[PDB]
Amino acid sequence: AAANDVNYSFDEAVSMQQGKGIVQTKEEDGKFVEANNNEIAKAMTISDNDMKYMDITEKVPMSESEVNQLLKGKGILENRGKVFLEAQEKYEVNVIYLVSHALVETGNGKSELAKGIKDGKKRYYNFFGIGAFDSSAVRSGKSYAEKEQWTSPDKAIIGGAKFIRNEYFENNQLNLYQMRWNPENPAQHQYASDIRWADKIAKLMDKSYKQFGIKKDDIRQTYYK
Ligand SMILES: [Cl-]
Ligand SMILES: [Cl-]
Ligand SMILES: [Cl-]
Ligand SMILES: [Cl-]
Ligand SMILES: [Cl-]
Ligand SMILES: [Cl-]
Ligand SMILES: [Cl-]
Ligand SMILES: [Cl-]
Ligand SMILES: [Cl-]
Questions:
Q1: What separation in Å is there between the alpha carbon of 199 and the centre of ligand 6?
Q2: C-alpha to C-alpha distance for 69 and 40, rounded to whole angstroms
Q3: What is the 151 CA–ligand 5 centroid distance (Å)?
Q4: Chain centroid to CA 62
């Protein structure tokens, strides 16, 4: 019956995002530091061709050749376009979004962490920042990548898409803004602490859209009372 997800005023949501102990970060002087209250408030204000506000739960017409063009020179992700498109079709996840999120998270496919974490005779991979992903967490089995047996790059790509679909898109977090700021339930179930997480992914998405001439899906700009 009720499909009304506009639950809070902006000022109420801001106060929640500023709440006790809540980690919100910003890049400064080469590293991440805690964002202040004004920076958090500015970051969540509603204002890259609105790619942050675009539904990413639909598919785009990108061939494996086109996806591999985006992944050329992208380290461990190079020449994995066919698997990104398996993920798009299996889970109904926009493949330009999926590629853009992986490229931001993995440093263009070239970070040391993107090469995975060893445990016993296996290596675990994680291209989307899902759950805890370091040697401690992997050794102790308190790592989502290990729980889901993401034991190859291809498994991490399919599995990341499955996670995003089942945990975010099926939770009515349908665009980057909602993933980051969850305005229906502020400060809960948010993808990242970086206050410009959405902006980084959206900037790459907009470049890829304009590179291939892709039509934008629905843009939503009303989230608050
Ligand atoms: Cl093709
Ligand atoms: Cl491929
Ligand atoms: Cl975890
Ligand atoms: Cl939620
Ligand atoms: Cl944002
Ligand atoms: Cl333009
Ligand atoms: Cl199109
Ligand atoms: Cl609004
Ligand atoms: Cl009004």
A1: 17
A2: 36
A3: 32
A4: 19
Are the C-beta atoms of residues 201 and 220 closer than 8 Å to each other?
no
Distance CA 208, CA 201 (A): 11
How far is the centre of ligand 9, averaged over its atoms, from the C-alpha of 9 (Å)?
11
Ligand 8 centre distance from Cα of residue 18 (Å): 18
Strand partners, 34: 25
Q: Which two tokens stand for residue 89?
A: 């079709």
- Sequence-distant contacts of 212-218: CB under 8 A, at least 24 apart: 212/62, 212/66, 214/60, 214/61, 214/62, 214/96, 216/49, 216/50, 216/51, 216/54, 217/54, 217/55, 217/56, 217/58, 217/94, 218/54, 218/55
> Resolution, rounded to a tenth of an Å?
1.5
Q: Where are the alpha helices (DSSP H) in the chain?
A: 10-17, 37-44, 64-71, 81-91, 95-106, 135-140, 144-147, 153-163, 176-181, 197-212
Nearest ligand for residue 47 CA: 5
CA of 80 relative to ligand 1 center, distance in Å: 13
Q: Tell me the CA–centroid distance for residue 171 and ligand 4, in Å.
A: 7
In the structure encoding, which two tokens stand for residue 26, read together?
A: 């910003």
The one-letter amino acid at 166: N
Q: Where are the domains of the chain?
A: 1-225
Find the ligand nearest to 215 CA: 7
Number of H helices, E strands in the chain: 10, 4
Question: Given phi > 0 = left and psi -120 to 50 = alpha, else beta, which region is 209?
Answer: alpha
Residue 87: name the closest of 97, 76, 74 by CA. 97
